[PDB]
Amino acid sequence: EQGIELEHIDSKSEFAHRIMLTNILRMMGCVKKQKSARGIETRPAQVILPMSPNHGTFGGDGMYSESKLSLETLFNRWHSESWANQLTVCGAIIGWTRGTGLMSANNIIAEGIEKMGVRTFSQKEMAFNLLGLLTPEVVELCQKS
Amino acid sequence: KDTYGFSILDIVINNPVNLTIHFGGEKGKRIRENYSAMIFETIVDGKLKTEKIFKEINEHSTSYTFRSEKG
């Protein structure tokens, strides 16, 4: 969603928000229903949620920020509802990752951002970071909370 | 179900060839403990020598598969 400010939020943004929020909740719900229908209480699926530090900071991204911020409810819902044994929540707050469908439009400035003593990531590095969440130690951590 | 994570009814009705027990989550760790705490208690030279049934089940095991040819 590029160049979509508040006043432009329309069909595309609603559809994007369905992909990036609503149907993620539905997908999780479906996995919960399948596991519960089969009595699987001891093999939870770790959900690696693609969270963002971008909650309306850049602007012009339609309902992107709303999609990403809304995923943060899952951290509390894991405790408050009845799906914790079927799903675990792993919120990855994904940093500035160069080269992707969402961020390729922002590649030219990344050397400048890094002069602030900050880090941008290749897709390889970010993938390596996220694969770190699927290691046995983090998997056990998400099963606790 | 509560202790070893399997249904004896399921085995009678469906006679599965293999059965994997998953040790995920709090309930799974409790079931894993039960499999680990399952021990042979022998007396050798007036000394309690506790051995383990399920040697392959340790504190890093995420599952255990019971195996059969036919069921």
Transcribe A68-132 into DSSP letters: HHHTTHHHHHHHHSS-TTTEEEEEEE---BTTSTTTGGGGGGHHHHHHTT---B-HHHHHHHHHG
Structure solved using which method? cryo-EM
Q: What is the dihedral of CA A70, A73, A74, A75, to 10 degrees?
A: 130
* Alpha carbon distances (Å) from A42 to A79, B55, B70: 17, 21, 26
* Alpha carbon distances (Å) from A119 to A95, A106, B69: 8, 14, 55
Test mutation, A31, A36, A38, A43, chain B, max B CBs within 10 A = A43
Dist. CA A113–CA B39, nearest whole Å: 59
Dist. CA A17–CA A23, nearest whole Å: 9
- Beta bridge partners, A131, equal none
Distance from CA of A88 to the nearest CA of B (A): 9
Contacts of B26 in chain A (CB under 8 A): 143-144
Dist. CA A31–CA A128, nearest whole Å: 26
- The minimal CB distance from B25 to the residues A39, A136, A143 is found for A143
Contacts of B22 in chain A (CB under 8 A): 40, 42-43
**Residue type at B49 in one-letter notation:** K
The alpha carbon of residue A140 and the mean position of all alpha carbons in its chain are separated, in whole angstroms, by 20
Dist. CA A23–CA A9, nearest whole Å: 19
Q: Is B57 on the interface with A (CB under 8 A)?
A: no
* Alpha carbon distances (Å) from B12 to A13, A99, B1, B5, B18: 53, 55, 14, 15, 13
Q: Is A79 on the interface with B (CB under 8 A)?
A: no
- Token look-up 């290691």 returns A135
β pairing state of A45-51 and A87-93: parallel
Q: Which two tokens stand for residue A98?
A: 């160069």
Q: How many CB atoms lie within 10 A of CB A88?
A: 23
Dist. CA B57–CA B36, nearest whole Å: 7
For B43, the 3-state DSSP assignment is strand
Element containing residue A11 per DSSP (H, E): helix A11-17
Contacts of B28 in chain A (CB under 8 A): 41-43
Tally of CA atoms within 13 A in the half-sphere of A59 that contains its CB? 4
Beta-carbon separation of B27 and A85 below 8 A: yes
Resolution of the solved structure (Å): 1.9
- Beta bridge partners, B50, equal B41
Contact at 8 Å (CB) between B24 and B62? yes
Dist. CA A3–CA A99, nearest whole Å: 19
Dist. CA A116–CA A18, nearest whole Å: 36
B15: left (phi over 0), alpha (psi -120 to 50) or beta: left
- The minimal CB distance from A42 to the residues B7, B23, B60 is found for B23
Q: How many CB atoms lie within 10 A of CB A20?
A: 19
For A41, the 3-state DSSP assignment is coil
Distance from CA of B61 to the nearest CA of A (A): 10
Q: How many CB atoms lie within 10 A of CB B23?
A: 24
DSSP A44: P
Contacts of B27 in chain A (CB under 8 A): 41-42, 85
Closest CA to B39 of B58, B29, B53: B53
Q: Is A31 on the interface with B (CB under 8 A)?
A: no
- The minimal CB distance from A42 to the residues B7, B28, B60 is found for B28
Contacts of A57 (CB under 8 A, 6+ apart): A65
Nearest-10 crossing angle of helices B25-37, A136-144: 110
